[PDB]
Design a binder for this molecule. Sequence first.
Ligand SMILES: COc1ccc(F)cc1[C@@H](C)Oc1cc(-c2cnnn2C)cnc1N
Length: 285
Amino acid sequence: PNYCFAGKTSSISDLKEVPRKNITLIRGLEVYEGQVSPLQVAVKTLPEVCSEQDELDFLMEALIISKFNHQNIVRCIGVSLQSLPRFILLELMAGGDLKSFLRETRPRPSQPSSLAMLDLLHVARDIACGCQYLEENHFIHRDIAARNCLLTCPGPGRVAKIGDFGMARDIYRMLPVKWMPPEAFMEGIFTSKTDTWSFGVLLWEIFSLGYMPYPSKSNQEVLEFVTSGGRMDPPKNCPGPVYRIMTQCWQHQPEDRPNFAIILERIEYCTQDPDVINTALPIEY
Ligand SMILES: COc1ccc(F)cc1[C@@H](C)Oc1cc(-c2cnnn2C)cnc1N
């Protein structure tokens, strides 16, 4: 089984196999926190009880992640496929996944400024850079969403990175309906503009502080809503310029939507506008 990315073909043999003795599991997080000799790592494990397909899936996932080279995509430290159970070793992202972080770190009476608008813009900017990298390398992610993003740490130095490529893995060889543009439902045509649409939904998730998109709508209701021109309202307290980026991401015609270079440019503008970043987030009770 080969994998083609950018200007290079690669196989299992090119994967950096780490001697099993050098790998220690520290605790569960099927993922564990681990150590390699000392590098902190996350360990994704393939269950020994699985089918042939699970094994090629696991292998293709390792190939995919191992070929990426960008600071906003989680690194693959290596693999251990010659011992059971098989491991994929990933950069350990201590802040956890983005969706959970937004829900746990919402401004509250016990910590009214735990998070501010600039923090959310930096996360959006980080993922957008990741996405620009995928775009310019002609890789379509297909599942951009907060559940698939990770943070290096809880505190103010945090960096957001794209952390899961399972959907792209399957496609290479379960539509995330609420993150999908109209043409995906009706034409099944996918483009980097597909990711642009998803990023807009991700933006909404971020600035809502981790709400489910289209609150109160089922998948089919969303599908009909969006196909007929409907769009989400801004998240509570969302700055007008940030909502504008979302709605630009959600233009009905793919070609009307910005590429990620333009998105990054507009997020930076937002970061430079004091009227945006001086906006307070809602305090939750
Ligand atoms: C549930 O796992 C995921 C969820 C979403 C993703 F995008 C990637 C992963 C997995 C494959 O990767 C990591 C997980 C964590 C983590 C999660 N919760 N706490 N921690 C400490 C840290 N670093 C990773 N590399």
